[PDB]
């Protein structure tokens, strides 16, 4: 059963489509005859269009609003099989050339949607008296249903396909379903077919790049949620469409929004934040520099030689994580924040400066810089830092611009508890408080590998000893809410799926 979502393109991409999971956009010869069931609408915009096999419209999309059967400006258009349009209203309007259709009623073809049912130009249905309306109501809808109410795996009519995951009371956990079937269109498929990727709702779709990410956790690609920003490689300054650009300019700042892995080199120079003339680019606003905050790796060099003064840190690049120097500015410098007015270097995440040597120089007000142990951050043995000519180290100490003692001696890229390479105590997320909430604390977390792990929110805090040993509700020691078998739970399972999707009462 072929599927579809310029006239020749449509007549070639819809001719053999037995069922279209998109919509029936027949607008403006006899290329379609076997369109059995449609999980959507039908954009009929023209006088002889057979449409014999058109049976069910699900109305998942609408032309304007609940507009499934939109017509305009077709006597020999025998949609005889179209007996029940589901989840939509018939906009059977503008029928100037339509014949024998006014004789047939247009209401039995729709269910509980006569409210938005506008139609204008026992009884025969289509062209020719050989066709009839074939009343069957005045869960089958097309007359072991021929067309199912929601889903028809092979022949049965089902509201929902067998879930890919079925709770396992034997394992006392919500496990997978061995007979799990992804709901491909209106049919349950054991394997996600048609090179379709498993989706969040389980309905495999061939495109799940919106607020998600593609992954392969099994032999079938799975659409996973976009962890923060999803990976979206964009070429930088020097490579790609901006290969001849000289800086991250205002005309070029926008294309870098949500750009994860800048594959060239970000090289914000004085010209950009100054604005360039002979390059025909107006001045870049300091606020728009926040667009680059999604950057997570710069497979190149960052030579940030001017940043806005009212920002006391290089906060706009506060998410750089790998600055691997595939290309090197001046061949030796990879990160080269030089001659700025930044207070604290602020690059709180940069934990792999692979190739170049790092020169954080001239920044006459960057004080927390010198203390960092640049040996681990450097990734290649030919890296030798050049932290020079900053504000006075003795001046730094006397002024008190020293790392907050809630930080390990590894050095700290900012005065705040967030910007510290390692923590003297354990760490709670980005920053590192003096102590985790082992006994006293709101989140009631548990330290792990010198890192705070917030306990299961379904687990009550305990006042005598530590609250929850490890992540996951099973590892929590106290659970004020109900506990399901050997694991704590939000609630006991009642509407669960069993051997035959049985609603397991479980316990009381």
């Amino acid at each position, epitope marked *: 059963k072929k599927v579809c979502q310029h006239f020749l393109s449509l007549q070639r991409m819809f001719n053999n489509c037995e069922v279209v999971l998109g919509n029936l956009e027949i607008t403006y010869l006899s290329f379609l005859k076997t369109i059995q069931e449609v999980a959507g609408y039908v954009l009929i915009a023209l006088e002889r269009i057979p449409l014999e096999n058109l049976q069910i419209i699900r109305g998942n999309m609408y032309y304007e609003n609940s507009y499934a059967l939109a017509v305009l400006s077709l006597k020999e258009l025998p949609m005889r099989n179209l007996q029940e349009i589901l989840h939509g209203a018939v906009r059977f309007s503008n029928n100037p050339a339509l014949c024998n259709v006014e004789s047939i009623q247009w209401r039995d073809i729709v269910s509980s949607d006569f409210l938005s049912n506008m139609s204008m130009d026992g009884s025969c249905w289509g062209a020719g008296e050989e066709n009839c309306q074939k009343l069957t109501k005045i869960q089958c809808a097309a007359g072991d249903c021929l067309v199912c109410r929601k889903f028809r795996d092979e022949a049965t009519c089902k509201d929902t396909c067998p879930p890919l995951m079925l709770y396992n009371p034997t394992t006392y956990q919500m496990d997978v379903n061995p007979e799990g079937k992804y709901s491909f269109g209106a049919t349950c498929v054991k394997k996600c077919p048609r090179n379709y990727v498993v989706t969040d709702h389980g309905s495999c779709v061939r495109a799940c790049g919106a607020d998600s990410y593609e992954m392969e956790e099994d032999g079938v690609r799975k659409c996973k949620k976009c962890e923060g920003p999803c990976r979206k490689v964009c070429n930088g300054i020097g490579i790609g469409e901006f290969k*001849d650009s*000289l800086s991250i300019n205002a*005309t070029n700042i926008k294309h870098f929004k949500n750009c994860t892995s800048i594959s060239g080199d970000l090289h914000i*120079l*004085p*010209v950009a934040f*100054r*604005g*360039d*003339s*002979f*390059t*025909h*680019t*107006p*001045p870049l606003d300091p606020q728009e520099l926040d667009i680059l905050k999604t950057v997570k790796e710069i497979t190149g060099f960052l030579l940030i*030689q*001017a940043w806005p003064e009212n920002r006391t840190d290089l906060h706009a690049f506060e998410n750089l994580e790998i600055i691997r120097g595939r290309t090197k500015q001046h061949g030796q410098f990879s990160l080269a924040v030089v*001659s700025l007015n930044i207070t604290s270097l602020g690059l709180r995440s940069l934990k792999e400066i692979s190739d170049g040597d790092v020169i954080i120089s001239g920044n006459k007000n960057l004080c927390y810089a010198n203390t960092i142990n640049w040996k681990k951050l450097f990734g290649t043995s030919g890296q030798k830092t050049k932290i020079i000519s900053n504000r006075g180290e003795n001046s730094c100490k006397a002024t008190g611009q020293v790392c907050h003692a809630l930080c390990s001696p590894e050095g700290c890229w900012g005065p705040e508890p967030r910007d510290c390479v390692s923590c003297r105590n354990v760490s709670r997320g980005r920053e590192c408080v003096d102590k985790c909430n082992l006994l006293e604390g709101e989140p009631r977390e548990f330290v792990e590998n010198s890192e705070c792990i917030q306990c299961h929110p379904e687990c009550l805090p305990q006042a005598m000893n530590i609250t929850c040993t490890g992540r996951g509700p099973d590892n929590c020691i106290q659970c004020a809410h109900y506990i399901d078998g050997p694991h704590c739970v939000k609630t006991c399972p009642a509407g669960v799926m069993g051997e035959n999707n049985t609603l397991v009462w479980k316990y009381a």
Partner: single-chain antibody
Amino acid sequence: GSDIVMTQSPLSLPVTPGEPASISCRSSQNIVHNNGITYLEWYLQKPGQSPQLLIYKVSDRFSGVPDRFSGSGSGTDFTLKISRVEAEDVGVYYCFQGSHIPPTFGQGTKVEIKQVQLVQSGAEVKKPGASVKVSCKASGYTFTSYWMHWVRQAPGQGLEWMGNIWPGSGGTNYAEKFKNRVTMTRDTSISTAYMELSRLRSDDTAVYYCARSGGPYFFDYWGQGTLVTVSS
């Protein structure tokens, strides 16, 4: 489009002091870039001095450029007005057109009567076919932070941009009129730029003034410029 003939309506129009002078220039194409900023300017060139910029955008004024001079225009029509004209106002007003990829100064109306300093090199005279290396020493600004465009003012002709070089990255953008004769080099160590024009011809003799194209204005602060006459 690159040759946006910026015809100036008057030519060598003389004006007595204290009069509402108005000099209008028309652009061969519409002077409107994709960025929408009418990169238009009307630079004054005092006699025997580097040209200076007066209207940094379509009607603004540069710092130190008095409010006495003003301008207006739209599309392909633009005009520069001197409500009050003084001895300072004397000179030739050449209008740059920054929308077209090759910057193009206009013919020019010479109005008559009815820190950071870029040091240029010294005057040299060569014979036809030879090469001249015009030098421009830079001080007062970060050398590797501002494009150094090099405009050439032919005797008996208007100014024409010739090519730029970003002092850091050595990248050159040479213009068409010398696309196969000129080479611009940089010495970041010495904060100086050289621009060797080889194969000197008779009609190439001009003072290759060395400018620094600014942020929102082109050709902001210009150098002394080294005259180079060539004839056999």
